[PDB]
Amino acid sequence: VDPNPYPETSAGFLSRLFFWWFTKMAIYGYRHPLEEKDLWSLKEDRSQMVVQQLLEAWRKQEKQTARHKASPRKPSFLKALLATFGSSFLISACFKLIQDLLSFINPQLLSILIRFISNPMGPSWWGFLVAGLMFLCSMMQSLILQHYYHYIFVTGVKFRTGIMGVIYRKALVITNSVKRASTVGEIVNLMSVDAQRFMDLAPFLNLLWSAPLQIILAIYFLWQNLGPSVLAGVAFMVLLIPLNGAVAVKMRAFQVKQMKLKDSRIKLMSEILNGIKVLKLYAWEPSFLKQVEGIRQGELQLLRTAAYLHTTTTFTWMCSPFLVTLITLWVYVYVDPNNVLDAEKAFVSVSLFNILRLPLNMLPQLISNLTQASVSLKRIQQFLSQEELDPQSVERKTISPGYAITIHSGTFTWAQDLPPTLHSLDIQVPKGALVAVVGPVGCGKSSLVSALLGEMEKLEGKVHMKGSVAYVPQQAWIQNCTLQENVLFGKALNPKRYQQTLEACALLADLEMLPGGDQTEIGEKGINLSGGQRQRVSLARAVYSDADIFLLDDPLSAVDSHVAKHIFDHVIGPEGVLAGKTRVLVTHGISFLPQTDFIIVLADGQVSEMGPYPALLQRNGSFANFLCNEEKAAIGTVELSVFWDYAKAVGLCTTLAICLLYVGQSAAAIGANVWLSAWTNDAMADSRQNNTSLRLGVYAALGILQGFLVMLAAMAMAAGGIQAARVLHQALLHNKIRSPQSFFDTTPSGRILNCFSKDIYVVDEVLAPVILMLLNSFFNAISTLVVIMASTPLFTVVILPLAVLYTLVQRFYAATSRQLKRLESVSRSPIYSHFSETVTGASVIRAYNRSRDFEIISDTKVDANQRSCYPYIISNRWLSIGVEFVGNCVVLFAALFAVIGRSSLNPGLVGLSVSYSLQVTFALNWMIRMMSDLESNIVAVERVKEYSKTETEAPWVVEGSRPPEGWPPRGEVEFRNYSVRYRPGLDLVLRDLSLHVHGGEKVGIVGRTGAGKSSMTLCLFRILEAAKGEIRIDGLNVADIGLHDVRSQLTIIPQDPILFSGTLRMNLDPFGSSEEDIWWALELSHLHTFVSSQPAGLDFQCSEGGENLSVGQRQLVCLARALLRKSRILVLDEATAAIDLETDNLIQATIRTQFDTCTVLTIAHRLNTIMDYTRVLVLDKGVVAEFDSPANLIAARGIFYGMARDAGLA
């Protein structure tokens, strides 16, 4: 059958009520990695079926829409979504009415226990029954809610897969104008945004009837307990919905302001990363750092003015429950003097204030989602009802005799409003005749091919065509698959043809040029083929199809003219493979006209000439005018060390204070109730007390001490996470800028810029708000468990068994959930990439009669996300049935221990223990969601930590070794006994060099390819350390002096000119240290006339990569920075390979005239540049051939002479 089947199918009453069938995937995920082939197979939910049902309705209603508009009553998707999925929502309503009405039993059974502990003369059986019936009503409420959630969430995965398939079946029949009116980006956003909103509205649709009920019964059952006063309490819960929203608007304002400053830092980093060569060689690295720090300081201050908007959310979650209990039990005591609080009317009016809170807090979200989704159903109903291509404008069943294409009196217009492109066209191409439709400028002709494929409106006329059609478009379409697929579109591989077709189009050299061969992937996610390459693949698809009629549109566009004749003779023309086909070629040239059997030339939209090429010459009418014209990383567990690194960064001291202020808030709260639970016993023990002031006041103060202490903690985990961000980024930017040259070359820049963008973002704006919620929920649960154990001291035995069961469900859940939420992210993207190709290429997909095949390639892509969405929706139900059993066992054991020990408890303590215990599940579910976000998001402190530790280059400046006074002036660089290599683990690239250069003579370096000439420039600047020997300059080894001082004193006109974005003020000088010289050198380099021309002058803006300035000007720009440096030695590099002579000529005279009194060492990419140099060093395979004059080398027949004859210079 199938190797892996949806487990549900086979399960019994007890494994399908408690979701025990997800157990095996859960155990497997933690230990082994999960892959797309271990995900279960969908039930026979498969898109093919869901889409069928949604379409059937639209058709009935739209078929009846001809009737509905005729009786406007436009067809409505809403009536189809409701007929198709409407009976299922009605079942889900009943599971919600039973959870809503079985959640008010437990608050009312509590009132019976707090009215038993009061009567000593009651048989103990009454108590043990209320303890059991308070666990059964709790079990029946969980196993029902978690079975409504399975239906509401699975219905979401089926609205998205049904409004994502009625859209992809309309894009393939929509007329040309609608595609032109809306950008393809907007049309693939009726699946990306609009269908996905329908999946997220699904959970909050049955809250338009529940929320307005749980809030109208809870207020009634609190009217009975506390009187009209409970109305004040609800006001302080209905006036926090406005306030929490106001904090949120002020947060977005902060986030948008930040997204401006972060994007600036990433851009200056990108430019530093993509130029770390010249930034290091010139000593500019100390300066480009201060530019990045200045932008980081601005980002850090803006994060300080957003701690205050996160302390406010911790105050509402932690201290809002107490404030409703104070306003309510304050108004009640005043409103009338006689009212007396008892345990029932103070701990049953607290368990009924929690049931009101989850529903009243989700009333704002329901209005947002049900209002964003009215916009979507308006868009998803416009696309579904726009006009469609006319299926029978062209006639394919039969044809007029001895012909294939006949159009009589046909006029075609792209749009009803637009001017008609073609008028009364008449054509009758005979079978197998090459007809070339050539016409003058004014374009058109195009409308001939698109008219025949049926893609324009036949306002008047008739078109008849017979046979299969193959269309080569004006702009080619390449599918996202392999080249071998593009060549055979939906065809079986006859090897002979595959050889005949590619080679006949000469794609054979191209296939060898393809790195992966013909099997390579082409498309957006593929090697980018050349424009001419694109046209050839398209022609190939057609030639393989072996179709009866070939409508070719300007295939000969980007093709090489010489190569094109070969394609014409081999495939298009009479001697070519396509010789019995009927071909209509729309071309704009006279070269191929003689070959054509007959030529259809037309003027405006009216045919002018219908004759052979000889006839065209004799006609001499407008034809004459036309002629003249690892595995662990995939699981992702986080080691306990990655949490000791965040702590050391925040501060070990700030971390103690956050805890000792959260263990001081708990005490205050766990005591403020021990005061209510001593005030609610005042009436029983003594008939009347006058102490209501001393008892209201103290409770209000102990509550305010909880609030003062939690705000001080929340403000110390939000100002202690902006000390981690400063410490962690400031060190990545320092180790990375100083990393040795090899790291930049071996490691792609894309990875380094990932760390300075996405990972430094999490460390700053995500971890601090998710560690203030793991703590909040951990302390709402530790307080709740301390009261029960103190009130009934034996409840302790149960805490250790239930804690093991709670840890095990979290360990197995997080591991599996993470893997499933990654397999889903990778899967979702393909569904959208296919839609964009179907909208862009729908004319080739339809003309080759392959529309169905392309509707099934979608269903195999919308049935690969579902196979990973379903396993996740079940996983959050196998956990929610484990946290709910370790939360219903606290209600049974906190009410089976009060009844065992009735004699020592009092009505109030039994109320305080049991009341709290009904709220363990909310706290425990938040602690599992928040512990999972921290483990997923704290991988970032691991990467920032590992990039920061790479090895570093020698000190930029070392004291005690400062450079000697005026050390460069002797100007002689002696290489002595030196050996060097690019990376540890490679063979020496230079060997034992021994040289002495007289100060100032121009020693050119001439070398064979593979002689490591490029090592010479790097070795002098200590980019690469000396493996053995020295490069002492003027008696001073460069090794002893600090790397930075030596580099600044020397001039390098680098091979690649780089202009980082900014100002010519900075590009010429970042330090900026002569006020007037910047112009003088620039004209010396013939650049000032261009600089003065632009009105701005200095500070003319230079784009990213200095793109605005032309390469030639940029090369001189290098000469300019150098012109300012004025060092004793000058080092050129790769002077010219493709650069123009005028700049090249300019450089050599200037460097000869201005750099004359200096040692000049020029590596030479062309031996032509090195002429008249006093002493020339020839290098071969790391050996110096000789040190003598160039003419002398020629007379002595050195390797240089062999190169000189290669140039032929002499």
DSSP-assigned letters across all residues of 502-551:
HHHTT-HHHHHHSTTGGG-BBSTTSB---HHHHHHHHHHHHHHHT-SEEE
> Phi and psi of 41, rounded to 5°?
-90, 135
Tokens of 270: 């990108």
Residues after which the chain has a gap (C–N > 2.5 Å)? 44, 71, 629, 1073
- 1145 close to 1171: Cβ distance less than 8 angstroms: no
> Phi and psi of 461, rounded to 5°?
115, 180
Tell whether 1009 is in a known binding site: yes
Element (H, E) at 820: helix 796-840
Rounded to an integer, what distance in angstroms lies between the CA atom of residue 454 and that of residue 452?
5
Residue 458: strand pairing partners:
412
Strands 598-603 and 435-438: parallel
Residue 405: strand pairing partners:
429, 465
Q: Is 1101 helix (H, G, I), strand (E, B) or coil?
A: strand
Rounded to an integer, what distance in angstroms lies between the CA atom of residue 662 and that of residue 925?
20
Q: What single letter denotes the amino acid at residue 340?
A: V
Cα angle 360, 366, 369 (rounded to 5 degrees) comes to 160
Tell whether 561 is in a known binding site: no
Residue 1030: strand pairing partners:
976
Which residues, 6 or more positions from 562, have their beta carbon under 8 angstroms from its beta carbon?
none
Rounded to an integer, what distance in angstroms lies between the CA atom of residue 990 and that of residue 832?
53
Rounded to an integer, what distance in angstroms lies between the CA atom of residue 424 and that of residue 696?
96
Rounded to an integer, what distance in angstroms lies between the CA atom of residue 910 and that of residue 917?
11
Q: DSSP class of residue 443?
A: -
Q: What single letter denotes the amino acid at residue 843?
A: S
Instruction: Please tell me the experimental approach by which this structure was elucidated.
Output: cryo-EM
Rounded to an integer, what distance in angstroms lies between the CA atom of residue 59 and that of residue 1110?
60
- Residue in 551, 554, 531, 529 with CA at minimum distance from that of residue 542: 551
Tokens of 751: 């990875």
Tell whether 446 is in a known binding site: yes
Cα angle 1185, 1191, 1194 (rounded to 5 degrees) comes to 60
- Residue in 81, 176, 156 with CA at minimum distance from that of residue 381: 81
Tell whether 1011 is in a known binding site: yes
In sign, the C-alpha dihedral spanning 1063, 1068, 1071, 1073 is: negative
Helices marked H in 431-507 — which ranges? 446-452, 483-487, 495-504
Strands 1183-1188 and 976-980: unpaired
Tell whether 442 is in a known binding site: yes
- 1154 close to 1084: Cβ distance less than 8 angstroms: yes
Tell whether 445 is in a known binding site: yes
Rounded to an integer, what distance in angstroms lies between the CA atom of residue 3 and that of residue 403?
56
Other Cβ atoms less than 10 A from the Cβ of 261: the count is: 15
Rounded to an integer, what distance in angstroms lies between the CA atom of residue 110 and that of residue 137?
12
Tell whether 516 is in a known binding site: no
> Phi and psi of 511, rounded to 5°?
-65, -40
Report CA-CA distances (Å) from 609 to 406, 427, 1072, 1126, 1175: 16, 11, 72, 74, 75
Tell whether 443 is in a known binding site: yes
Tokens of 378: 């308006």
- Residue in 105, 99, 97, 107 with CA at minimum distance from that of residue 919: 107
Q: Which residues of 290-309 are buried (b: 16+ CB within 10 A; e: fewer)?
A: ebbeebbeebeebbeebbeb
Q: Is 588 helix (H, G, I), strand (E, B) or coil?
A: coil
Tokens of 956: 């930029």
- Residue in 476, 496, 474 with CA at minimum distance from that of residue 486: 476
Strands 606-611 and 1051-1052: unpaired
Tell whether 444 is in a known binding site: yes
Other Cβ atoms less than 10 A from the Cβ of 1168: the count is: 14
SS3 letters for 275-295?
A: CHHHHHHCCCHHHHHHHHHHH
Strands 1051-1052 and 549-553: unpaired
Tokens of 585: 């070629």
- 426 close to 462: Cβ distance less than 8 angstroms: no
- Residue in 209, 210, 229 with CA at minimum distance from that of residue 219: 229
Report CA-CA distances (Å) from 784 to 352, 788, 920, 972: 17, 7, 7, 81
- 426 close to 409: Cβ distance less than 8 angstroms: yes
Helices marked H in 386-487 — which ranges? 446-452, 483-487
- 152 close to 89: Cβ distance less than 8 angstroms: no
SS3 letters for 374-398?
A: HHHHHHHHHHHHCCECCCCCEECCC
CATH superfamily of 402-628: P-loop containing nucleotide triphosphate hydrolases (3.40.50.300)
User: 């191209």: which residue's tokens?
Assistant: 510
Max Cα distance, the chain (Å): 128
User: 1166: burial class by Cβ within 10 Å (0-12, 13-18, 19+)?
Assistant: middle
Q: Is 798 helix (H, G, I), strand (E, B) or coil?
A: helix
Tokens of 936: 């997923």
Which residues, 6 or more positions from 1210, have their beta carbon under 8 angstroms from its beta carbon?
1194, 1204
Strands 422-429 and 1051-1052: unpaired
> Phi and psi of 1007, rounded to 5°?
-145, 155
Tell whether 867 is in a known binding site: no
Tell whether 1054 is in a known binding site: no
Strands 435-438 and 582-586: parallel
Rounded to an integer, what distance in angstroms lies between the CA atom of residue 157 and that of residue 202?
9
> Phi and psi of 791, rounded to 5°?
-65, -45
SS3 letters for 1059-1089?
A: CCCEEHHHHHCCCCCCCCHHHHHHHHCCCHH
- 199 close to 869: Cβ distance less than 8 angstroms: no
Tokens of 856: 């099934």
Q: Is 237 helix (H, G, I), strand (E, B) or coil?
A: helix
Residue 413: strand pairing partners:
457
Which residues, 6 or more positions from 881, have their beta carbon under 8 angstroms from its beta carbon?
18, 19, 142, 143, 146
Rounded to an integer, what distance in angstroms lies between the CA atom of residue 1049 and that of residue 1069?
15
Q: Is 67 helix (H, G, I), strand (E, B) or coil?
A: helix
CA 925 to chain centre: 29
Rounded to an integer, what distance in angstroms lies between the CA atom of residue 706 and that of residue 753?
44
Tell whether 605 is in a known binding site: no
Resolution for this model in angstroms, one decimal place? 3.3
- Residue in 278, 388, 187 with CA at minimum distance from that of residue 1105: 278
Element (H, E) at 598: strand 598-603
Query: Following DSSP, what letter does each residue of 849-909 receive, concatenated?
Result: T-SSHHHHHHHTTTTSSHHHHHHHHHHHHHSTTTTTHHHHHHHHHTSSHHHHTGGG--HHH
Tokens of 1042: 């600090």
Domain range annotation of the chain = 402-628
- 1021 close to 1041: Cβ distance less than 8 angstroms: no
Please give the sequence-ordered ranges of beta strands (E in DSSP) within 1084-1140, or none if there are none: 1101-1102, 1129-1132
Report CA-CA distances (Å) from 541 to 430, 664, 835: 24, 75, 21
Rounded to an integer, what distance in angstroms lies between the CA atom of residue 1051 and that of residue 1123?
9
Q: DSSP class of residue 626?
A: H
Other Cβ atoms less than 10 A from the Cβ of 120: the count is: 8
Rounded to an integer, what distance in angstroms lies between the CA atom of residue 1135 and that of residue 1119?
11
- 78 close to 124: Cβ distance less than 8 angstroms: no
Q: DSSP class of residue 603?
A: E
Rounded to an integer, what distance in angstroms lies between the CA atom of residue 259 and that of residue 874?
37
- Residue in 1072, 1205, 1152 with CA at minimum distance from that of residue 291: 1072
- 1129 close to 1161: Cβ distance less than 8 angstroms: yes
- Residue in 339, 314, 306 with CA at minimum distance from that of residue 227: 339
User: 560: burial class by Cβ within 10 Å (0-12, 13-18, 19+)?
Assistant: exposed
Element (H, E) at 1142: helix 1141-1154
In sign, the C-alpha dihedral spanning 164, 166, 168, 174 is: negative
Residue 5: strand pairing partners:
41
Element (H, E) at 224: helix 211-226
Tokens of 710: 């939690």
User: 1085: burial class by Cβ within 10 Å (0-12, 13-18, 19+)?
Assistant: buried
Helices (H) then strands (E): counts for the chain: 53, 21
Tokens of 903: 């004699």
- 286 close to 1044: Cβ distance less than 8 angstroms: yes
> Phi and psi of 394, rounded to 5°?
-100, 155
Tell whether 462 is in a known binding site: no
Rounded to an integer, what distance in angstroms lies between the CA atom of residue 211 and that of residue 356?
9
Q: Which residues of 183-213 are buried (b: 16+ CB within 10 A; e: fewer)?
A: eeeebbbbbeebbbbbbebbbbbbbeebbee
Report CA-CA distances (Å) from 1146 to 121, 1087, 1113, 1171: 113, 11, 11, 16
Rounded to an integer, what distance in angstroms lies between the CA atom of residue 232 and that of residue 381?
46
Rounded to an integer, what distance in angstroms lies between the CA atom of residue 1089 and that of residue 852?
64
Rounded to an integer, what distance in angstroms lies between the CA atom of residue 1123 and that of residue 1195?
37
Residue 522: strand pairing partners:
527
Length of the chain: 1210
- Residue in 513, 411, 408 with CA at minimum distance from that of residue 463: 408
Q: DSSP class of residue 472?
A: E
Report CA-CA distances (Å) from 331 to 201, 334, 705, 1187: 39, 5, 21, 103
Element (H, E) at 262: helix 241-273
- Residue in 1013, 1017, 975, 998 with CA at minimum distance from that of residue 1130: 1017
Element (H, E) at 1051: strand 1051-1052
User: 């040239």: which residue's tokens?
Assistant: 589
Tell whether 943 is in a known binding site: no
- Residue in 524, 518, 553 with CA at minimum distance from that of residue 537: 518
Q: Which residues of 58-89 are buried (b: 16+ CB within 10 A; e: fewer)?
A: beebbeebeebeeeeeebbbebbbebbbeeee
Rounded to an integer, what distance in angstroms lies between the CA atom of residue 709 and that of residue 701?
12
Q: Is 583 helix (H, G, I), strand (E, B) or coil?
A: strand
Rounded to an integer, what distance in angstroms lies between the CA atom of residue 675 and that of residue 566?
98
Q: Is 320 helix (H, G, I), strand (E, B) or coil?
A: helix
- 348 close to 907: Cβ distance less than 8 angstroms: no
Other Cβ atoms less than 10 A from the Cβ of 528: the count is: 11
Tokens of 629: 């014209």
Other Cβ atoms less than 10 A from the Cβ of 892: the count is: 18
Rounded to an integer, what distance in angstroms lies between the CA atom of residue 90 and that of residue 614?
78
